Paper text:
Contrary to all other class Ib RNRs studied to-date, the sole RNR of Bacillus subtilis displays class Ia-like activity regulation. We find that B. subtilis RNR has arrived at a remarkably similar solution to the ATP-cone through the evolution of two unique allosteric sites that modulate catalytic activity by inducing contrasting quaternary interactions that either enable or prevent the full range of motions needed for RNR activity.
With insight from SAXS (see the section “Methods”), a 2.50 Å resolution crystal structure of the S-dimer was obtained by co-crystallizing holo-NrdE with 5 mM Mg2+-ATP, 0.5 mM TTP, and 1 mM GDP. Electron density at the I-site showed strong evidence for an ADP ligand displacing dAMP. As ADP was not present in the crystallization condition, we suspect that it is a hydrolysis product of ATP (see the section “Methods”). Interestingly, we also observed nearby electron density for an ATP ligand with the adenine ring positioned against the F47-loop. With F47 in this conformation, it is unable to participate in the formation of an I-dimer interface. Unexpectedly, we were able to trap the final six residues of the NrdE C-terminus in the catalytic site of our 2.50 Å structure due to partial disulfide formation between the tail cysteines (C695, C698) and two catalytic-site cysteines (C382, C170). These linkages, particularly that involving C695 and the initial site of the catalytically essential thiyl radical, C382, are likely artifacts of sample oxidation. However, they allowed us to capture the flexible C-terminus, which has never before been visualized in any class I RNR.
Numbering used by the authors:
A (entry chain A), B (entry chain A): 6 to 238, 246 to 685, 695 to 700
Write the structure that this text describes.
Amino acid sequence: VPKWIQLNNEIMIQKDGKFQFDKDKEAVHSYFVDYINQNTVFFHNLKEKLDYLVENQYYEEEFLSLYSFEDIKEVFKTAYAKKFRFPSFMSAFKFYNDYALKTNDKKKILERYEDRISIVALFFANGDTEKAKEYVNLMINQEYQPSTPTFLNAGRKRRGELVSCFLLEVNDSLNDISRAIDISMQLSKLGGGVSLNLSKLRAKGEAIKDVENATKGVVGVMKLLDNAFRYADSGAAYLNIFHRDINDFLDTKKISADEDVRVKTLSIGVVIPDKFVELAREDKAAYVFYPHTIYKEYGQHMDEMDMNEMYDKFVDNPRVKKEKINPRKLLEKLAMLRSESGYPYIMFQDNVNKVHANNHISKVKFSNLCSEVLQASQVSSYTDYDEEDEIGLDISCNLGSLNILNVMEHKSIEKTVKLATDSLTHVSETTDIRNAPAVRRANKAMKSIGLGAMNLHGYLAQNGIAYESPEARDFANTFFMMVNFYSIQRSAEIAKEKGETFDQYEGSTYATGEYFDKYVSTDFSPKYEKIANLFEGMHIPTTEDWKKLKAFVAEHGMYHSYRLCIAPTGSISYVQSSTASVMPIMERIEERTYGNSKTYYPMPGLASNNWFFYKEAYDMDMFKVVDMIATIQQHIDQGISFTLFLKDTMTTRDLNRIDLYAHHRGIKTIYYACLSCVV
Amino acid sequence: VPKWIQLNNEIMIQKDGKFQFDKDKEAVHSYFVDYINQNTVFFHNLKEKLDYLVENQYYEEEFLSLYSFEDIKEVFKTAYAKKFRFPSFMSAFKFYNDYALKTNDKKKILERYEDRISIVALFFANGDTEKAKEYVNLMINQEYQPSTPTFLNAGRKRRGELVSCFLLEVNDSLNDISRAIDISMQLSKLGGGVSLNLSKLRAKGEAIKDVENATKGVVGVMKLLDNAFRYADSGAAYLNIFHRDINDFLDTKKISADEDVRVKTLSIGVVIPDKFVELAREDKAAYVFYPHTIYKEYGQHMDEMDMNEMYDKFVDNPRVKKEKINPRKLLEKLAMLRSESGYPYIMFQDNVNKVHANNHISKVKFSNLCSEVLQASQVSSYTDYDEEDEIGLDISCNLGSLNILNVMEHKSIEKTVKLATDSLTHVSETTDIRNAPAVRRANKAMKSIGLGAMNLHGYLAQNGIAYESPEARDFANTFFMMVNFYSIQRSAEIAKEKGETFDQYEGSTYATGEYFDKYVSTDFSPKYEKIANLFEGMHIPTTEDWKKLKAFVAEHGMYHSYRLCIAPTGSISYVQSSTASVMPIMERIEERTYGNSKTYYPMPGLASNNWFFYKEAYDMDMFKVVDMIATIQQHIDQGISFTLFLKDTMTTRDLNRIDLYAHHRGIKTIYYACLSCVV
Ligand SMILES: Nc1ncnc2c1ncn2[C@@H]1O[C@H](COP(=O)(O)OP(=O)(O)OP(=O)(O)O)[C@@H](O)[C@H]1O
Ligand SMILES: Nc1ncnc2c1ncn2[C@@H]1O[C@H](COP(=O)(O)OP(=O)(O)OP(=O)(O)O)[C@@H](O)[C@H]1O
Ligand SMILES: Cc1cn([C@H]2C[C@H](O)[C@@H](COP(=O)(O)OP(=O)(O)OP(=O)(O)O)O2)c(=O)[nH]c1=O
Ligand SMILES: Cc1cn([C@H]2C[C@H](O)[C@@H](COP(=O)(O)OP(=O)(O)OP(=O)(O)O)O2)c(=O)[nH]c1=O
Ligand SMILES: Nc1ncnc2c1ncn2[C@@H]1O[C@H](COP(=O)(O)OP(=O)(O)O)[C@@H](O)[C@H]1O
Ligand SMILES: Nc1ncnc2c1ncn2[C@@H]1O[C@H](COP(=O)(O)OP(=O)(O)O)[C@@H](O)[C@H]1O
Ligand SMILES: [Mg+2]
Ligand SMILES: [Mg+2]
């Protein structure tokens, strides 16, 4: 057993009752000197390194050719000037095991952490050598972490797509079903996570032409999709809760499900308008609808109509066919299934669209794997082979997360937010997906990005603030207000600089101005003095600054239809020495076995004198956590991946009381505690 | 229990030891007077009938509008002038239960047998009122029976496609696989039987781009197709025996197969070049090949190269990857699987192409469900969404069968063959399949039809000739030579009349003349005197008549790339009072239960003084049956659906000796004893 693993395990051998937290500094030092340095290829110079990496098909050539090699050396030297040292064993282990470029034979290390960062920065900057330096500092200071698809792939040949998260609409025809199968496979082949909205497909037992009772329904298309994802080397189906197939749709995922209906590689999500929550509260028998009878009567997809306005009219219309269900029992079934599998991802549709800026394009109808992407979409119609198709708007989103601790300590909320936006904008403009025409069309038209945040709990716990406290909410309220301020400002700056807005921007609430109403009348500076001290050195936007930004946007518009969403953070959380996303930590010390050895990872910053503040999520009040997320969500235009942390000693009514409380507080999406759609 | 069922069962109550065969004449009379006539809607006139059937969306309007109603009445009266009476209970039962148009509520009969025939004839004739009369007589005399898809659908609204048999090529890309899934569903939705050639897909464990060992292989695409056919309301996959996946391909159909690999709605067929049969005979270890390594080396699909020429070169080429197998044991496995399921349909590829007329277009590479369609094909390439596709040639075939007994008694071999061709040509020209571009392109370019024959055994047994006798072969030799003569002659007549040939006709052996070599040097008039007497009244083509037809074709060409194939005959065999296809009868008397009653159907014409000639197939020598089929096959340009009739007391070596003997005798396809691809 290696020496770094020896010192690593010595954390768990207590001294004066205290753990040996300092042993992990030795462990990662031993891990480098006695291993990493000896398997890292070292060239006589950097040009020799880059020429080798280019000539051996490791790196791409075009993006490097935009720089004079004297500039590439300055950028690399900027990365190494930091003298970055991983503070823990698992942080360095995860980077070299998951991210560092290895040789084709997987024997030696080609990239140090400074190398991957320099290459990504050279890619983002697109020739601007000083900007490349800015990106290097931003990443080497660990202020910003682009998503794994971007951070891992930028600058490679054989490089996968930098975006790997996609959402698809599916129209109610065999032609469209066939095209969705192929698109799913085309994206999944590229490593993408694909979520499809099935709410427009007619329900089981609806007519085809004049043959009554002919349709397989949603479960039939799920079976085809399940197989498509199996063949092409993870997908999701969403369904509106008022769709007649909702029960059958859910039952495909019961762990006891019969194999005739079983679907094994599809996640599921459920879309819940306010009207359903009211019916459930009142314990009144509800109706679910056969969507094609609604289409034949109203000429519109049920999915494109306002169920809060239309429910009673659908019920009274004799040409609309429906079924009676028990809304409380359906709500209970959603709790049971999430205890089994985490998902169904639950989306409170009216909590999304109440504050949605682009309802003029469409209401938000569904979300992605792990349910943080919330954007408008419009269904295509792929017609017969000899006819032109009608290309709509699907969704793809490009992700990154700033690191709250390092942003606060560097007092760089503005600079990080604006710079990270520039990078996500570059990934959006260099993406051209083939074989997904509505994804490609939407990416150019909508120009949407998704900037998030990680290390919320870690930063709070290291500054003496409990995750569940009202002080924690007071910090989050202010911090994310500021993130949103500078995000909107940078999007308008890019719109002025380029002279473009996203397509149909002038119909958005950004252009008509009501987006800014709460920001010009309400102040979001800290109510607690000790929280205000954390922001010392950074100007906090006032209602007056918001009035001037409102006016600025009104003159120049905005480049991005969407800017912010908070995805989960996977392995990269280790590399960042950061608690995952904005969630509370799960364990104070993680024990995982790797290759016949047990490794220990205490939470980033865990000491004996802050033990109390690293409170484990399962011991927290989920109602207080809901309050925290609802506070962050005020200033995020898309969504927040939100996993409830529950003990098995929870009755099904306790579970639904959380659901109802989350809906009450304005939460957009929720599930219980996705690789392509995480940072 | 009804009276017709009473008299029907009285056949089986013997008199002087003899069955009561005459009781079935009473049964079908009782079946009409006491039931059929009372549930048949009778209008005051025919215009009242047709107007009702048009106005109630039963019939189509366009084809009837091509006639003046005085002419429609003459055509209908021509049908009724025959005073056609069904000679047996089951013949009338099958027509009214399976073919006669009933009301939307399925309560009363709208069509008598004379009505369906008149409508089909009016459809075929396309305005020519005298031709409509010719079609009426041809069908009411039961000289010709168009296939069930055509006979059932012609003249309807809500009418399904008149062709329902299709064959598809699939290219080696994800794009092509996705298009084949959709095409399969588009055709299957229309009621089609779809067979796909999977021999071009790269084998399991081949590279994708530069990722080695990445491919699922043929079984992966079979699983997708299996699901496609399940969703869209029967298909087939063919594979060349030299494909590396052949064993895995076969194992998907073992009745004991694990569900991870199980395929439940796909038939399978295997394509066997001569080189494999030689390797099996010699008991020499054979090789199967990874087709993509062959493609990367030779630039051609293994499926498009001559394995008899290339086998040793493939084996010696170090850049071609292969696997060793046991050819004898593989041949044995094909016998086992056919005992289980009937198929794998076995195709002896060189027995097809040795006598194939259009090798210049392509070799024949695969066949259909029940394996009688044998035509050239060329693979498409469906490229990325933004790029033009390359449309190749798939296959569809339009079927019918003449009734040998009635053709011989009416001495109408010429008139039936030429008239049936005209009808199959009309079905071909009125077919426009959407969403299958290579099927549509091939149908116009190739103009192929498939005329067959039924009632061979019945006709032989009723003229004192045993199915296994050399006299039976002597009759078949002459009869089908004549069918082929007048078929070729009518195809050339249509080519002169229209001034067109099928595309690239001048590369065929019809144009270069070697097709006719055996017909200008060998006489095919009967060797047996009693067989020659059967043809009295009809001129038998001589070598001189063939020389003049050869010259005729050389001047005018031919309209049809393919003309003849002998499909199985399903329920319509009853309606025709005909033994199935050209096969020997299976049972002298069929006992089947329908609705709590047992029905009896003795073979068409079975009497006590011809009992010996209705010898049951399972008591026959399959080697003599192979001889019979090989004799018919000389004069059929496509294939013959050929089911072996075997007792379970057959060793696996006995089974392979039949296979080897069938190959020896030139048989093209074979399996053991399809609805969309039967007449
Ligand atoms: N394999 C490598 N070998 C050498 N330098 C590398 C390598 N990988 C990255 N670098 C980085 O490239 C930069 C320049 O490296 P190089 O050794 O060519 O220059 P130097 O000797 O440090 O400086 P100067 O140009 O003044 O000689 C340094 O920041 C170094 O850390
Ligand atoms: N339901 C039906 N009622 C009447 N005739 C029918 C019907 N179905 C088919 N036919 C056929 O239509 C043809 C003409 O029928 P119709 O009764 O109108 O004429 P008709 O009285 O026999 O002759 P004519 O025109 O000299 O009066 C006949 O051959 C008849 O068998
Ligand atoms: C994408 C994909 C293809 N395949 C199959 C389908 C095809 O038979 C083959 C890949 O064909 P293609 O889709 O044509 O792949 P490619 O063009 O990117 O790469 P290459 O140049 O090597 O053709 O492998 C899989 O087995 N799994 C997959 O996920
Ligand atoms: C063809 C087919 C469709 N479907 C589904 C797919 C679609 O959701 C719907 C049929 O859509 P379509 O493919 O659009 O059918 P259509 O246009 O011929 O008929 P209609 O005018 O009624 O749309 O039913 C099946 O369930 N099984 C099938 O076999
Ligand atoms: N925690 C660490 N993170 C990153 N690199 C490390 C770490 N520990 C050691 N190394 C690498 O090992 C080299 C030798 O280690 P050492 O001599 O202890 O440090 P230094 O270079 O500061 O004197 C360092 O220059 C560095 O490249
Ligand atoms: N075997 C049969 N096939 C067809 N139709 C039949 C048959 N037997 C009876 N029918 C129908 O029943 C009608 C009345 O039968 P019947 O009086 O016995 O015959 P016919 O009309 O020759 O005198 C016939 O006109 C005919 O339409
Ligand atoms: Mg439709
Ligand atoms: Mg390819």
